[PDB]
Each structure stands twice: as C-alpha cells, then as structure tokens.
C-alpha cells in the first residue's frame, strides 16, 4: 500500500527517500544509480525501495472524496 | 495379384490391347463450367448440363502422373476401390409406355475417381 517507514532488516529510515526516488526515476536516472544517489549501501534498503508497489494512489482513486 | 495405377491401366488397355473397354468414373460434384442457358447462382454444373462433342483432354505424364485437363483446370484421376463383384452396365430403353428394352452393354472392371487439384488452385492464388 504505502512505503514502510523503516527497513525490515536494518531499520534505516527509508520512508522519506521514496518520494525523491520517484523524482530520480522521473528523470533519465536508472534504478541502481538512483539508489546510489539516495545513499543505500546495503541491499536491504535497496530491496525495500525497489520492490515497493504504490497501491495507495490506486486505492485513493477509489476513495470517496 | 498386382494393384494397378492409372498410367499402367491406360497403358495396358491401349498399347497391349486394342479392344474397347467399359469404364465407370466418379467426377467431382460440379464441373468447371456454367449451365448453357439452362436456367442456372453457381449451381450444380454436372455432366448432364453439358453438350456433345469433345469435352476434355486426358494427359498421361511422366513418372506415372495422370491428369485430366478440362479446359483451364486440371483434375487428377485415381484408382477407385477395386470392386471384385459383378457390375453390369445396362440400358433401359422405354420404347413404349408399357415396354422397355433391357440392354446389357458390358461388364464394369475398373472404377475411376476425378478430383480437383486443390493445391494447384491454392498456389495459383
């Protein structure tokens, strides 16, 4: 649904880095170099950012509003 | 006993033997023509609707291939099933309203099958 705040294994703050991440993918940037720019050395944070699905926007499209 | 092929059949019955023979053949359902002013819709143009005179050409090709050029189209002729029983071709001449001449004409020894070369029609277009 929404990006988790903390990495499951290590626990680094990853919630805030998600939005700018989409900005990086908004430009020409690839996935790996974007993750390097965000500063995700270990692969657990990279996994969490990469594998996430932003279902929250699709659900909000169905919200009452 | 050997099982003959059209090339062998016609070769033996023409070259080795000069005696005329009675054949029976099954044509396709419709012939490559149109009923001449017979009130036709691409309906069944059978042998009956045609007229007298030369109607087709039979070609014995090399390698045993036998074909029947019927104008622009070329049908393929094959052995039918070899019937071993008695098949006699008779004529029923109804000379009078209550009289008829049963006229046996001859035995039927071989049966032929004619079918369109659908492969030729397809690769044609």
């Amino acid at each position: 649904m929404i990006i988790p705040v903390r990495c499951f294994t290590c626990g680094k703050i990853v919630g805030n880095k998600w939005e700018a991440y989409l900005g990086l993918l908004q430009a020409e940037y690839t996935e790996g170099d974007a993750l390097d720019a965000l500063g995700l050395k270990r692969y657990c944070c990279r996994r969490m950012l990469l594998a996430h699905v932003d279902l929250i926007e699709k659900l909000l499209n169905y919200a009452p509003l | 006993l050997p099982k003959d092929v059209s090339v062998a059949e016609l070769l033996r019955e023409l070259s080795l033997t000069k005696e005329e023979e009675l054949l029976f053949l099954q044509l396709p359902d419709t012939l490559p023509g149109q009923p001449p002013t017979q009130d036709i819709a691409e309906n069944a143009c059978t042998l009956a609707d045609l007229t007298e005179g030369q109607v087709g050409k039979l070609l014995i090709r090399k390698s045993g291939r036998v074909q029947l050029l019927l104008g622009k189209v070329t049908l393929d002729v094959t052995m039918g099933t070899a019937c071993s029983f008695l098949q006699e071709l008779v004529s029923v001449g109804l000379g009078d309203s209550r009289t008829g001449e049963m006229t046996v004409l001859g035995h039927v020894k071989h049966k032929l099958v004619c079918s369109p070369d659908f492969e030729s029609l397809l690769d044609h277009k």
């Binding site: 690839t30 996935e31 790996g32 974007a34 993750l35 692969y43 657990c44 990279r46 996994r47 990469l50 594998a51 | -």
Partner: protein, 99 residues
C-alpha cells in the same frame, strides 16, 4: 525435497537487489547462474552468496559461511489465532447429551 530452485532464486534475488534489476525465473529458461554470479562478484560479494557471518550471541565468527539472500515469502490464511480452540463443559445436544 531437492528444491534447488529456492537456492537459485535466492542467488538471483541477491544479484538483482544489488544491481537494481529484476531477474527472470521463467520455466525452461530465465537468468542463468553465471550471469548472477558475475553480477555478485562485480558488486563486491562472494560469487556463491555465502558470506562471512559473526554470531550475534557469542560475538565470534561462524566456522562455516552462511547463505544470505532476499526471498519471496507469502503469509498464509491459516493462523493460530483462528485455529486455537478450548472446550469447557459448554453446551450439549437435546437428543444425545454430548458436546
């Protein structure tokens, strides 16, 4: 159970999360072991996934290398909270006086 597929999936997943790709495990094909091994060695990890690991309890390194990797776990519907059941005296049936 001879589920070598799990080991191959773990290796491929580690390689993918290291290089930011999505390796394919398509039947009768997919990414091969050599490619993920090259991806792992390029990023600075052991080419077979096994890593040098220190025990959390003792603080001493483990004698044998351990096999880390990200794998896809799916939770199941069967949960203990629904399956747990205990029965006291409780009710009985009118015809035969049994639970």
């Amino acid at each position: 159970r001879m589920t070598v597929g799990k080991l191959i999936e773990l290796l491929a997943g580690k390689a993918g999360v290291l290089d930011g790709r999505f390796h394919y495990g398509t039947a009768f094909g997919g990414s091969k072991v050599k490619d993920v091994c090259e991806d792992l060695v390029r990023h600075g990890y052991n080419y077979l996934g096994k890593d040098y690991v220190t025990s959390g309890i003792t603080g001493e390194p483990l004698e044998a290398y351990i096999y880390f990797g990200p794998v896809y776990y799916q939770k199941l519907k069967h949960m203990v909270l629904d399956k747990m059941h205990a029965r006291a005296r409780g009710p009985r049936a009118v015809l035969t006086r049994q639970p």
